[model samples]
Target chain A: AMANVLIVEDRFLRTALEGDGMRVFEAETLQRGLLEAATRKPDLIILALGLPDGDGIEFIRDLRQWSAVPVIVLSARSEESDKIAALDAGADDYLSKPFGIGELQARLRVALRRH
Target chain B: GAMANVLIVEDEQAIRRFLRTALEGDGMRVFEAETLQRGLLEAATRKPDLIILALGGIEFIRDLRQWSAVPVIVLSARSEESDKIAALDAGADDYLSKPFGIGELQARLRVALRRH
Candidate 1:
């Protein structure tokens, strides 16, 4: 299947994914993310934790209430506690900033394969 | 969550004990192997829901993936991105560096087992 992935991040993480032939969507804030997630029903989500509006962890917590769509968190925060909190709050995976696009793609495959 | 079986494939006795203690505390049935060969044996025989493999076991993960889609979280002392990428490419579900918190391990385990 051609997976629809929602990139709930501030930057263009979309370009890297476009080559994979996925229908990628983008949102800059938690609110827009939530709305995109609800309306589009993505096969997976790549979430950036430090959104301009609200916490990404809260976004996962909220999304878990209604959807089991796989969530892979991308963050500039490399703190163990930050990754732990995101994973504990129902993120399926976590990737720190300045990560390789290949690494992200691999993790994305893992997340999507499981889902 | 119900009790899930976990296998810790590590060379260090102390790390295995620490993982056993932490995972047991979280209500998981834990099994340990001190070598990658033994770890493969344990995995085949015990059929754990998750496997925490140490750094030297990337080949073990590759071998295991031929028959099992068991969730394997690689535990390595090396925090290098290349190491993480190699492990994931070798079929690990997740990667964690040494000196990690128990909370993070637990959360990673939860994520792994949730998909299992």
Candidate 2:
């Protein structure tokens, strides 16, 4: 089995990862993602920067307080402050949507191997 | 050689002058912006063939990606792989970590122009 992966609420993006052969988990908000991340302790996290609950940067900050699980941020946001903050907040990588699945898959492999 | 218009978005005066001199000497016309706001505006209005920005740098790529696909080459002092990945994902065409080389900048400018 591949590593446990948690994908937060994104528009149809989970489809790409679902068939990729992993134990996939998902959350619709940063609220639930925070909860699942701790309870499930997923090997990797794919989060949308803007979600129903809050900014992904803050979520990464909250999660980093307790764990080092890799995070890859997905967003349509066009601010460097956001991406820089997410990286500073402990995100592993950030891919702006609409992202190509091949790169997303490639980023996952790099993060998971180090997992 | 055909002179290309280049937009340089940077806050530091010394670096800006350095870039302007080199870019002009290399047969590229240069446009300058001292702040992010103006730089972005210049990017759109001038429609420069290439943009060379030295930021603590990331945001502008995606902003440009919104309506313009102008090639962006980022020059930053940051060497982190994540930063590079973020810039690329944020729609940057190329990234070079400082200390910079005029040789590489010139070469990369050629690459951006070639693609355009």
Candidate 3:
């Protein structure tokens, strides 16, 4: 079965994900996204570091407490440090913004394959 | 029960139309309000089952929370921790950021109502 992907991104990202034919559960803020994650039980989650409601890393940390579902970080920050911090915080992978759709889909496949 | 009524409070016309189209597509009865003051009035008078506040940030959530216990979900672009904290503390049931999909909003809306 195709895995359900929960996308915790701002509006723009969510639209692109949907257009790519992925099943997406969306949350606007870190808190709400976490709550949705707890309830929706998605197979994978894509979180943006910049959320309108809060920091996405905090969400990854909180989600790690109860769920080991793979989380991929999506952000506009291209710095190595930011990527390292997110990876250390429990993200399975990090994709910098202005990313190509093919690369994101490939990364998602790899991340899901690990689980 | 009858079909659920949703009040969409958004300032942007295109976004508001998009949400209305999406919600209605999901078999919902949608009501629209373009400004904060008008939104509050609609929330009170329309008495919708759920309120989607597409405000710029926490200010509108705080304003609505002062008197209403109605479920309010904020749609914003400010991704700061302080912004989330302020909106949640003020009484928002959920928060969604900009550039989100209509399907995701529908799914989250289902979850929000399921709890209530």
Candidate 4:
């Protein structure tokens, strides 16, 4: 069955993911994204670290407190520290921006496979 | 008063459309702007109950902080603690990194809006 993926990304990436056939629930801010995740109960979550309302790391930490759902960090920060922070915060995998579409899809597979 | 209004400021077309669909589905009024310039204009003209600013650059967030104070929420890809501190210091009420969950985002939105 096709998995329901809640994409907590901004407008650009959400469209691309939905176009790729994933079930996407779009939220522009970390706060709103968290609401969707709770209500939607998606199989996987793709989190970005920058939102207009709250820190994505805090958001991840908050979610980790109650949920073990798979989270993949898709961010533009290419630095290793950023990636480590997200992983340490509870993300299963991290992808830097300007990423390949295929690589993202494959990583999604890996994240979901762990669940 | 009617349902609360939310302005979504994002440069990505698909994501904007998707958010519109979802928020509207949840019974909230939604507005969209594709850039910071457009977002400022919308915020001034629409005067929404809440603002969602999906910005990737620090400069843009700083620029918006110059005048607006109407519950501005930031959405970006910067994962560093310094970046989050900068945005919060600049005037944003909340910030979320990219690839986040909808449920958590909505919960934060409630908290922010509740304060306003």
Candidate 5:
């Protein structure tokens, strides 16, 4: 009973999370990510903080207005400030990239289990 | 700076002996406990400066945390974030997934010791 996930990252993440049994919608840029969110409602969202077009934190701020969908942010930099900004902007969890696939899946499970 | 005591709290002797030789040759006092049960007892009596543990021995972390702030580094095959997070939150100072090189382990130990 998992809802389809609309991810605003890349196809690789889409493929891996698809293994979690969701119809993952992939978007490569922030502009497209906003569109994907509107076109397909996702149970949760995982936004990479460094979007090609704009700050993903702004996207979370924008997404928070109309949707209460959980947002888990991913970042390559492990800076404390970056993580703080994401969570404050409404991200539910933060993950560092080049991470273990098992940990990613476990964190995803935790994301859904909240609701 | 010249000497420090380290404990290996692992169920695998192969790993324990490996760490023992590595640490002894690398310059340190090494103690061994092959069970989480014995590891806890050793931690109480040995008062080692550093502890290398199996993630399965994480319960030992909670007990040790009650009184000790000794630096603990956990090694595990579990790549799950939650498991690593739990160990860290439980008072582990750092984590190294298994299949790691001795050089990396040595570096982490050096950092942990230096910080301590």
Candidate 6:
């Protein structure tokens, strides 16, 4: 089954998910991320820790108030603090930046399957 | 270039033995630590690519994260979401509830190793 995926990122990740037939939504800032998430109700979320408007950790925290959508965080390399905070806030899984698209896809599938 | 090294940290001998056998069967080098202190020691010395911890608290994960970026998969007997949040927020890469199958562990392990 095809899934609606929200990619809340500062820059484009250019994943193979679109080629794999999943609907992808991109949000460059935290505000837009929340907007897309609330309106799209995506099956999974791939969120970046840093955003132009605010921290993505706060994005996860705020989103958890009413939605149970699965979230997988994308953190900058060695940005351990943000990673931990996102997970603590309710992210389902996380991967550091400079990661392979394959790895992200695998984790994405796992997160989707669990939810 | 070399076989992946996996560290198992748990107090229960039975669970340690089971994990060792399963991980070894999957063609990874398996190291066992029965205590939190020893787990930290092995993590520093062996420098395993991944660590599978059973309970033993988030403090161990927090302490390990202070120095190491190796992925840690926490296994907990409790099914509480708070416990999982505490573990992951403390630096764990993933959390699995008890009575899980080896297949699920291997899948999560693959995700961890690929990123590291």
Candidate number with greatest DockQ: 4
Report fnat, model 1: 0.00
Per-residue lDDT tens digits for candidate 5, residues B21-91, read 66787798999888888888899999999998865466789999999999999887777898989999999
State, as a TM-score between 0 and 1, how close model 2 is to the true structure. Answer: 0.49
TM-score of 6: 0.49
lDDT of 3 by residue, A1-115 (tens): 6578988766665676677667777777666676566545788998876522235555665566435789988777577777776778788988876788789888888987888
Tens digits of per-residue lDDT, candidate 3, B5-107, equal: 9999877554565566557767899999988888888988998889988765466666777777778887766667787778888889887664454556778
lDDT of 4 at B94: 88
DockQ of each: 0.01, 0.01, 0.03, 0.11, 0.01, 0.01
The sequence of per-residue lDDT tens digits that candidate 4 reaches over residues B1-116 is: 45789999887654575567667766789999887788778877998888888876456556756766678777766778998898888778888885555667777877877852
Q: How many clashing residue pairs, candidate 5?
A: 0
> Where does model 1 exceed 4 Å of error?
A1-115
**Candidate 5 residue-wise lDDT, A9-104, digit = tens:** 635777878776877766787666754564356788878765222366667755553256778887776777777787897778888766887887
Candidate 6 lDDT at A102 equals: 83
What 10-residue stretch in candidate 4 chain A is worst by lDDT? A48-57
Model 2 chain B worst lDDT window (10 residues)? B12-21
Interface root mean square deviation per prediction: 16.5, 19.9, 12.8, 8.5, 22.6, 17.5
In model 3, what is the error at residue B40, expressed in angstroms?
Answer: 0.8
Question: What tens-digit string does per-residue lDDT give for candidate 4 at A1-115?
Answer: 7777877765766676777777776677766776566556789998865422237676776566435789998776577776777789888988877788789988888888878
Residue range B36-93, candidate 6, lDDT tens digits: 9999999999999999898837888889999999999987767799898889899999
Off by over 4 Å in 6: A1-115
Show the lowest summed lDDT stretch of 10 residues, model 5 chain A.
A49-58
* Candidate 4 backbone overlaps, count: 55
The most accurate candidate by TM-score is 4
| Candidate 2 residue lDDT tens string, A1-115 | 7778898764356666777887778888666676567545789998875532345666776566435789988887556677788888788998875668898899999998887
lDDT of 1 at A111: 86
lDDT of 1 by residue, A6-107 (tens): 888753567768887888888876666765564457899988765222366667765664357899987775778778888898889988876898999999
Q: Evaluate candidate 4 and give its CAPRI docking class based on DockQ.
A: incorrect
Candidate 4 TM-score versus the reference: 0.53
TM-score of 3: 0.49
